[PDB]
Design a protein around this ligand. Sequence first.
Ligand SMILES: NC(=O)C1=CN([C@@H]2O[C@H](COP(=O)(O)OP(=O)(O)OC[C@H]3O[C@@H](n4cnc5c(N)ncnc54)[C@H](O)[C@@H]3O)[C@@H](O)[C@H]2O)C=CC1
Ligand SMILES: NC(=O)C1=CN([C@@H]2O[C@H](COP(=O)(O)OP(=O)(O)OC[C@H]3O[C@@H](n4cnc5c(N)ncnc54)[C@H](O)[C@@H]3O)[C@@H](O)[C@H]2O)C=CC1
Lengths: 289, 289
Amino acid sequence: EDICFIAGIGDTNGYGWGIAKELSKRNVKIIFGIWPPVYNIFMKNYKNGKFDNDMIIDKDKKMNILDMLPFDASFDTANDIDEETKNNKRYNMLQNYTIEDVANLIHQKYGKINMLVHSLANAKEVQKDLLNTSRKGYLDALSKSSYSLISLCKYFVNIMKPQSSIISLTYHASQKVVPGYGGGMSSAKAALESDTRVLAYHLGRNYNIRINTISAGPLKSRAATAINKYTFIDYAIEYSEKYAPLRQKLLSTDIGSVASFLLSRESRAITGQTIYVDNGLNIMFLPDD
Amino acid sequence: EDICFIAGIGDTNGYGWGIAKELSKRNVKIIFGIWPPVYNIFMKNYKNGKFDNDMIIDKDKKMNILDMLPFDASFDTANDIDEETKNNKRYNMLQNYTIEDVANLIHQKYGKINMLVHSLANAKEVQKDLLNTSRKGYLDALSKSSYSLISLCKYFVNIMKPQSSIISLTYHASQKVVPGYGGGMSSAKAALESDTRVLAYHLGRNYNIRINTISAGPLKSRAATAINKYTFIDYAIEYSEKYAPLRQKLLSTDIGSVASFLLSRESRAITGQTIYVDNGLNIMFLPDD
Ligand SMILES: NC(=O)C1=CN([C@@H]2O[C@H](COP(=O)(O)OP(=O)(O)OC[C@H]3O[C@@H](n4cnc5c(N)ncnc54)[C@H](O)[C@@H]3O)[C@@H](O)[C@H]2O)C=CC1
Ligand SMILES: NC(=O)C1=CN([C@@H]2O[C@H](COP(=O)(O)OP(=O)(O)OC[C@H]3O[C@@H](n4cnc5c(N)ncnc54)[C@H](O)[C@@H]3O)[C@@H](O)[C@H]2O)C=CC1
């Protein structure tokens, strides 16, 4: 029985969904971690069957979601919750949404898991360029998009089985400059990739757990659409579809099937790596046009 | 009907064999390309059942070998083979072993294939360090170990279906220095890796075909043993098992399962990449003890 917790899903148009979809093809139980502010709305859409078609698997089956829990990557433990949030309308009717709390919650209800997916990003000033990003906004991007991975590993390793696997999503902006990806997001991804290597060492040596990161190509999702700089995401997609070695549309399931492989034992020898799933765009220097 | 041609197998102790074994789990037909000098010995052992145990695939499956053909990567076409090798004791009783001839041969007997594996390397002066390698020895290593890939692509591309996949094997000595990996082999691996990217562009744009390379960890194979440096290989294996993030023996089938994934459609969005399957050793800078 393989159980996978996916941190970072707010709809069916992101990478988290493509990953859950592909893992279902392999019969793995899925648990969603939903950011509190969109939890109730997500449950409403779910309950009203708005995701039904999106849950049908190729092999003529239904995606099996074990559970859906409110989850906020910016809070490590219960005593980290501040006043302003502890009174927020969207957080009031919710409890146990901190990293340690969800880990205890999952362990208590379903036992130990063996697959972990970090699929979340957030930066307050993603619209501003690096030079004009404030210290507060910069640290916010790193806390939510980078440190969250470290904390997830620290708390979930206690409820994971040996030889389990972890993955996260990153973007090439960390290695090469892409104008438009601001707010410290490029910085956060750079830390994520570096941290993945160091975590691979500690997790590998002490628990025999693997951890890799997938560098994906452009995907018109909510997080992306909110980067605007006809917006940043529309440009990257068009560019990728014109100049990438492989001229085909990049689907969330393309990252999903690769994630599925990295999360399985088929890849027991791969760890601390940044795997590119972008139709090869990253190998290009000079375009044809 | 998936058909894969594996170029570079002289026994069951190499990566070519582990790859063949893993591909058989997915029921893909295997065609072996055997270097002429060792063709007779290999057929002899196979015939006398000296590989029957190695052909056992976990699930009691029996490795499915479609065909076994003599093959020499140093010759592009029939009129490339010199008089000497032509009348050589080991080549006399054989024919159609050049790159162009095996392609036409496979096509004529089985039609188009969709999987190509370049699993060979060779260097006359591997025992010498770069500084002391002659021009002749250097060009020989590149000719046999690097150009062979480009040539294989040129002739096999015509007998491959769209969306097919190609992989080769490389070693980290191309990116970082490992004393002992001489004769221009480090050079050859560097070329192969760069060529993999360039070919991904061409193969991808014109044939919608993918090509990637696997950077494997140390394996005590025949080619590896030739690198007399208690030999280079024993050191590398011992060093990998004591310092890699994942302390475990690296099996040929570990590279095999990754090869299998890259050759299947599950990796449609990956191309031109160098994927490390080395228990994570490449991410380390300073060893522990
Ligand atoms: N869309 C793209 O073009 C690319 C995306 N990526 C990465 O893929 C990952 C997922 O992003 P997408 O599928 O693009 O977008 P997405 O918008 O579907 O997913 C991001 C999720 O993070 C959640 N989030 C924000 N702050 C949170 C917090 N404090 N706690 C928990 N959840 C929180 C949101 O609810 C959202 O569902 C991100 O890490 C992103 O950087 C990597 C390459 C490209
Ligand atoms: N063993 C190791 O530690 C590592 C090996 N590699 C690569 O893996 C690939 C396969 O090597 P191994 O499994 O190590 O050794 P192997 O010695 O079993 O296989 C190489 C094969 O190439 C064939 N060969 C040599 N010249 C040829 C020619 N002109 N035409 C056709 N075949 C020819 C040999 O018969 C041999 O079977 C090589 O490209 C090697 O560089 C990459 C990382 C590590």
